[PDB]
Design a protein around this ligand. Structure first.
Ligand code: CFM
Ligand code: CFM
Ligand SMILES: [Ca+2]
Ligand SMILES: [Ca+2]
Lengths: 525, 457, 457, 525
């Protein structure tokens, strides 16, 4: 359809009207699922939700590893604003071990460093961080001025590595790269893949699983790994959250990779299949359907009925305790309408869950994700690069001569074929969205106010900037990023926390008492 | 909540757990103190998200700002093209009466000249009939948010202050980097002494306020452009913060020639009295019975609570103006400022504190300008202190070493309602004495023996 | 903080840890709301002392009163001679304008006829010109301290509020047995409205007050005797809370037919909106922006903290009139009233908060009129509650049973400052949403695991 | 001269001025020790601080015995006002020990009870308390109407007691009795002597000493016993303190009785000697002087070389322990003026401790004390009674025959000469007092004010209602009853608590900040 595109586009000056246009797509059966324009420049002076390259690299992929001091090279706010903002949970490895979640380390650049590039203040701060805390590795991250003042944070880490004797990893993620934090993921995924996965010894166990791309926000991974510990799977590495450097290093002591977030870890999912023969699956541990399917798919990739039998037993057991609440949740919430806007992947996963409560997701979109996250992985042969995206170096992986194996032969095609087990595939969001559904890439402050005033959603799931705008006009914004300081929202157990939190949030008494007696009635008293 | 070497180490380059943040968000705060202003970050877009997200978290409110969203290419071709486009999508889509612009690391490192860019948009008709663009330069690698506040105050006098030859009998007040509640309290006090004012910035009906059911991109508090223009025709300016209201103070007076007085932020008896005294020596106003009662109810509380407030050593971290005057209050109360830290630079913090301790014969206290929370925690581990007053991240030390904690400053992103309390005035000070007495008595009644526990305290 | 059974023992004779005191203190309190009036315990000696001590230990302020200092001999020959000597010694040495007499169980069991002793004194020239002794009969083995307050306020209409025809344009407001900060806020919403009033009693410039560094036996606040006289020819009387306020209101309405209006004590949205609406409806005038905004900020604070508020079970213990208004406000906060007790007798309390939970759909509640603290702790032994809002003695249940607790009512004797901020209006509701939320966040921040410790909340 | 006495008096209606003069005296050279009229009835409509019989019987004396349910027979205010205000700290005997200290029991009298007698409610409430709690004894206390109404609590008690098994003990202290709280201390003292005190069966111990008239306010008794325990005595009863009903029944199994408050249990001291042969000394553990001579005289009575040197050993080690701050307290506190008005012992006991500091007492009185307390136990032949007052049971005893014993032979008169060990004697207040001082029995608010404004002290010790009048006028008042909710103020460690509290009281800065800079010379210019 096209009619709401005109209500939104009506106001834009025509040059912005032209650019903006491809980013708003409406799904019609007619146009049986279409193409959106994702991952280009943000338009200046539009109010967007989006970030910087460093926000996806230090912020989200690298930040989570618990025993590496992660130091920022640049002025203070790049470190300050990473200090407990995104809430990934660690606890030290097995009571002992390091945990650095509580601190932020910086080089606090000053004007002399900006004019005479602070590379010994990095040499010094690197040796200092090591002497004080003697960590597993140290990671140096780049901020906007490092690049321009010519600081080769890469060379400094190489010298550093050899005097200090610890891995010191340099990451160039200056906030003026790409167009959003999606670019940042790509930059980080490369250094991990090369110089930390694979390096290591720890021999593998049976049923070794890795959950890839799960930053354990609000406990989520501890929850998935509860249910899987429970089947007999050995999750070798969650890539990240509560990940030890030593556990990332041996992430090849696995059998399947289970990509939960496709937009941040697909580069590794791909490069691993190639070097070691560790096939990836798209997995979804959010919402019951997503979860039951993920469990049955990976049990089908693994070969055996003992493990399929126990999966069915623990599937049952689990959803039956969770049942009467599921029921409750539906009865309070059916008929309501949601719009969803996160970045990368959470507008999609949280959808199955909302169908489970009878809520209709009318509108959805991402603030930094690419075309294959909406349409499908298929379209990746097909992409127009002018952009500014991962015009950021791409790297190539060749079979590890020694640790290469093919873990499933060609009944892999019997997976993809039969019962549609998602072996190395994703078919995005749009696919799942209902008809007469709207998708908006890098939706701004303008766009959500006509979606809000034209369409009237009962709830709107965005983030923090945006939370208090929606809430102020009398509609319920729950933030899907930071869980509204709750957790888990993954697994069978998260599902019931997400359910009540939402129930409670709609049935909040003060919602109905925003308008006073003298205004809405006694206008002259 | 651990792993700090107890054994103190002095660090030259590793900054851990900073007690400051970068200039642009102070400049965003102050710009939200002008009515129908929409702040603009001129640099990459990461910096906008971060600063509006901290402003929402501390006030459980919306910060609204726009970006010249800089890419790879602006490193080669400036940000001229970027703010030009930015201004056209702003005025077209969401029109402020004023776009107040500030910069980040990038624009300052690349050498961006947003004096010519503005004149270009202007010559090029990109600024509509009667609207305007203001700017300040907020370089991230020098100073902190107190300095971004202090610079946006100057850019707005510099673009807008006018002496149009006709004095108002008003006194201009620049409240410093204080929250909506403190601006609101000082307005409450002016008017109590019956003195007309112009107060800029004025976050009052902007970063607190009503859920009514309609959202406005431009809430209705803040100062009106017209009044910001009239500051040039006042009789006096009062700067409440030498670190934050003073560039403005001077710059108003070098430009419009309106003379200024610098006071301390009005926290506690000494500095709040000199605030009412400045309002008297200037207009000649007799101080009412009301404020007199307010002073005395602080004195009866200060005196009634006295046993608990005497010989209590306090660790205090924060921004220079608020921690200097709150350290005076802590002395006035009966207590000892044992560890006094600011992340934000400047000699004056440290040598104003030095001769209040020295003044009072307090000894052993450590005063650190440009120090962080890792420093104050190591200190607590070689010398345990009796109270902690800090912004939200103080809590990590306070649970490790079980310390009574009073949240104070920017940023407190933790509790609800805190932005409706003054810390200024006698009312603010009553509320301070009250929470300091309670966190202490809270710990006592939790720590004590059954049999050894009281009903009247 | 021991000895209570889990296994409930519903007692019919043994009262343990009560939720009330006898009559005389509310009457004493009420008398301190008249300017230049000395309260007098006509009776037993040690009563006056005990009663003046709960006011001095709540407010951390003096409560002055005199005694008839009965002996064994007054228990034969009356307490007449005893009050006649006291009237003399009171006027010569301490010189009140008015003496407000109220009684005790001794004189009340003795049946001591005050109105004839009173008559005797100035028919035998004893009470000078411009002086007055007024009185109320206060049988301590009836009701409670709210009944006492009820009774002093109807004795004050009986002796003073006369209709001379020369009618003012005022509405009278009886604030209930609420604190001096509550009486201050209810005057101030009237000031935001322009409505001319007379509030009696008024402990505002009295039981909270400033150290002058001079002691005055008659503090400056309190209802003037010339104002209490023109309470007979005013346009309307509003009485805030049935049990405390209706009695003077109906009795005034009877001697001088002055209407009266009974509305609840203004705590939270309903009770405050309604108070406000009542002033509007009655005077024709419209509600100011100051109030729309205090109102908006309240709804906004209850909406931002909503996460925490929803489904918290609460144990309430206090007075009938305010726990009626407060249970409605936890009902609109989203919490459940689980255990609502008052010690003070009366059907209404049963009935009103009963209705309140039917039109709300709340079940599992034990509401109890004329209960005690032992009862609520035994209930909590069976199924726990999430928050406790009682006076100071509920703190023993709090500590023992690790329940969040906010102090509220008569008497809070542990803390400093409480007495200077309201629980009434929009302000005191903001304040209350703030404190129940901090108590709940502080708890969870304290008892979570170290990987469950959060920074934004 | 000292026309302060005359100044206080002159504003007084002349019938009052003639009763009031006998109450204020000046001790002076010509007159070491003048007469004072004491235990007078209180004049009506003068602010007196005095309480009632019930405060002294139920709240003060009996109150501290922690395993009896002490139930107030009467209306609710009488029970509510003895709920935790009097600070007797108690602790369960040896872990499993009943303690009812944080509870306040009542038959709460009602209307129907006045017109028909709540005698039957008292009967049912007694076995409700016993059933629910199972006390050691139950205690019944009578307020104002109970005498008036005819319920004879004595007879209900005695009966229910037989039923229940346990001791139910009825005490008539209806507050219209007496002239003050003294009346309550005489009433309590006969009953506990007659039917509680020599009813146990413990086998007396080595150096069984007893402290009598010590109620343990803020752990005062706990400090007294830690010095006494160190030395080698076995304290056997503290009379009432943190006492089990049981060690009161065995108060008779001591050799020496240390009376700390003379006004309250001097009737016990007296009858205890006369029935069992146990001598009392006048002890004082407040002030380092007070406590060292107590100890020395105690040793004079258990004349025992090791005990007599163990006292000398512990005294010295313990004063080294508090030395450095005792002479710091002095540096700051000498040269200051003090006035004391307390109940009927403290105005006198603290008087040495002030002096030890260098603080002089100038004026001092007592609420309800008598002539032996101001003047010395010797005038007890010169006193005669009624104030309006005295129809208080004068109990009388006979020595046991089978249980009386000569603890000291007539060695006692060796000692009453031999540095006059205050063995079964007490020289009151006036003779610790210096010349030109004032004593003021039953001080009014008028008196305090004249004293305060003429003499302008530096501290004035008193209690909760005086506390706030005195400091609103801007002068320090600390509380000698409640200790300002800290303590011990008695003991050795207890000296230090007072000194620091007190010096931190004087040196509080808001004292000096009461005048606003404008109405000073800065607000008429
Ligand atoms: S906005 Fe995720 S692609 Fe990235 S911080 Fe959130 S919807 Fe990021 S799911 Fe993840 S843990 Fe995230 S929620 Fe992919 S990692 S740059 Mo803001
Ligand atoms: S006012 Fe003691 S004769 Fe009695 S309660 Fe205090 S100066 Fe009493 S020492 Fe004692 S524990 Fe006392 S402090 Fe005699 S017992 S009727 Mo108010
Ligand atoms: Ca808000
Ligand atoms: Ca006070």
């Amino acid at each position: 359809s096209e009619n709401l595109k005109d209500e939104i586009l009506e106001k834009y000056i025509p040059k912005t009207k032209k650019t903006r246009s491809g980013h708003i797509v409406i799904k019609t059966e007619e146009t049986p699922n279409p193409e959106i324009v994702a991952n280009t420049r943000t338009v200046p002076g539009i109010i967007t939700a989006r970030g910087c390259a460093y926000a996806g690299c230090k912020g989200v992929v690298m930040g989570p590893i618990k025993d590496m001091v992660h130091i920022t090279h640049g002025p203070i706010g790049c470190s300050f604003y990473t200090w407990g903002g995104r809430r990934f949970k660690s606890k030290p490895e097995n009571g002992t071990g390091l945990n650095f979640n509580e601190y932020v380390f910086s080089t606090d650049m000053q004007e002399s460093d900006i004019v005479f590039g602070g590379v010994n203040k990095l040499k010094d701060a690197i040796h200092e961080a090591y002497e004080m805390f003697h960590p597993a590795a140290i990671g140096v991250y780049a901020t906007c001025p490092v690049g321009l003042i010519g600081d080769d944070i890469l060379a400094v880490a190489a010298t550093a590595s050899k005097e200090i004797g610890i891995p010191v990893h340099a990451f160039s993620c200056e906030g003026y790269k790409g167009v959003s934090q999606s670019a940042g993921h790509h930059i980080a995924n490369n250094t991990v893949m090369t110089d930390i996965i694979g390096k290591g010894n720890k021999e593998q166990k049976k049923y070794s699983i890795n959950v890839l791309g799960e930053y354990n926000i609000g406990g989520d991974a501890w929850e998935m790994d509860r249910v899987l510990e429970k089947i007999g799977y050995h999750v070798n590495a969650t890539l990240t959250g509560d990940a030890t450097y030593e556990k990332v290093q041996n992430a090849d002591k696995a059998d399947l990779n289970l990509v939960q977030c496709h937009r941040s870890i697909n580069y590794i999912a791909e490069m691993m299949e190639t070097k070691y023969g560790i096939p990836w699956i798209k997995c979804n541990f959010i919402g019951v359907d997503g979860i039951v399917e993920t469990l049955r798919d990976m049990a089908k990739c693994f070969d055996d009925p003992e493990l399929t039998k126990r999966t069915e037993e623990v599937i049952a057991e689990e959803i039956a305790a969770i049942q009467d609440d599921l029921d409750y949740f539906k009865e309070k919430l059916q008929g309501k309408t949601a719009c969803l806007y996160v970045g990368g992947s959470r507008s999609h996963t949280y959808m199955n869950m909302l169908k489970s409560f009878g809520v209709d997701s009318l509108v959805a979109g991402f603030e930094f994700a690419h075309r294959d996250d909406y349409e499908g992985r298929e379209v990746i042969p097909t992409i127009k690069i002018d952009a500014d995206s991962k015009n950021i170096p791409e790297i190539t992986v060749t079979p590890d001569e020694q640790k290469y194996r093919v873990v499933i032969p060609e009944d892999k095609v019997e997976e993809l074929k039969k019962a549609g087990v998602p072996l190395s595939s994703y078919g995005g969001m749009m696919k799942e969205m209902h008809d007469g559904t709207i998708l908006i890439d890098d939706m701004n402050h303008h766009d959500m106010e006509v979606v809000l005033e034209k369409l009237k959603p009962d709830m709107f799931f965005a983030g923090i900037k945006e939370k208090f705008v929606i809430q102020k006009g009398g509609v319920l914004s729950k933030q899907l990023h930071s869980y509204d300081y709750n957790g888990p929202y993954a697994g069978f157990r998260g599902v019931v926390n997400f359910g009540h939190e939402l129930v409670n949030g709609i049935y909040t008494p003060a919602w109905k008492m925003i308008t006073p007696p003298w205004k809405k009635a006694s206008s002259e008293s | 909540l651990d792993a700090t070497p107890k054994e103190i180490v002095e660090r030259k380059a590793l900054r851990i757990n900073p007690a400051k943040t970068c200039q642009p968000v102070g400049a965003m705060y102050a710009a939200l103190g002008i009515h129908n202003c929409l702040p603009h970050s001129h640099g990459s877009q990461g910096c906008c998200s971060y600063h509006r997200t901290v402003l929402s978290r501390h006030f459980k409110e919306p910060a609204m700002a726009s970006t010249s969203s800089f890419t790879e290419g602006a490193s080669v071709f400036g940000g001229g093209s970027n703010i030009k486009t930015a201004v056209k999508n702003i005025f077209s889509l969401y029109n402020p009466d004023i776009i107040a612009v500030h910069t980040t690391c990038l624009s300052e490192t690349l050498g961006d000249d947003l004096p010519t860019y503005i004149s270009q948009m202007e010559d090029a008709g990109s600024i509509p009939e009667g609207k305007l663009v203001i700017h300040t330069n907020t370089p991230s690698y020098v100073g902190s948010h107190v300095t971004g506040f202090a610079n946006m105050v100057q850019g707005i006098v510099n673009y807008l202050s006018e002496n149009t030859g006709a004095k108002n009998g008003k006194i201009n007040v620049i409240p410093g980097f204080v929250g909506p509640a403190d601006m609101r309290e000082i307005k409450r006090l002016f008017e109590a002494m019956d003195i007309p004012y112009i107060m800029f910035p004025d976050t009052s009906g902007v970063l607190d306020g009503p859920t009514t059911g309609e959202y406005k991109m431009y809430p209705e508090g803040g100062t009106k452009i017209e009044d910001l223009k009239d500051t040039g025709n006042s009789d006096l300016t009062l700067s409440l913060g030498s670190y934050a209201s003073d560039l403005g103070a001077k710059t108003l007076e070098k430009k419009c020639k309106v003379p200024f007085k610098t006071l301390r932020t009005p926290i506690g008896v000494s500095a709040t009295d000199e605030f009412i005294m400045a309002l008297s020596e200037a207009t000649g106003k007799e101080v009412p019975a009301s404020i007199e009662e307010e002073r005395g109810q602080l004195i009866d509380l200060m005196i009634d609570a006295q046993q608990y407030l005497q010989g209590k050593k306090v660790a205090l971290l924060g921004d220079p103006d608020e921690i200097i005057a709150l350290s005076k209050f802590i002395i006035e109360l009966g207590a000892i400022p044992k560890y006094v830290v600011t992340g934000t630079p400047g000699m004056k913090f440290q040598k104003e504190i030095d001769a209040m301790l020295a003044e009072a014969g307090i000894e052993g206290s450590k005063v650190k300008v440009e120090g962080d929370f890792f420093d104050v925690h190591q200190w607590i581990k070689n010398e345990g202190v009796d109270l902690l007053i800090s912004n939200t991240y103080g809590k990590f030390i306070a649970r490790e070493e079980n310390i009574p904690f009073v949240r104070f400053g920017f940023p407190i992103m933790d509790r609800y309602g805190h932005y409706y309390n003054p810390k200024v005035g006698y009312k603010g000070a009553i509320r301070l004495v009250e929470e300091i007495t309670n966190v202490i008595l809270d710990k006592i009644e939790r720590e004590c023996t059954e049999e050894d526990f009281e009903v009247v305290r």
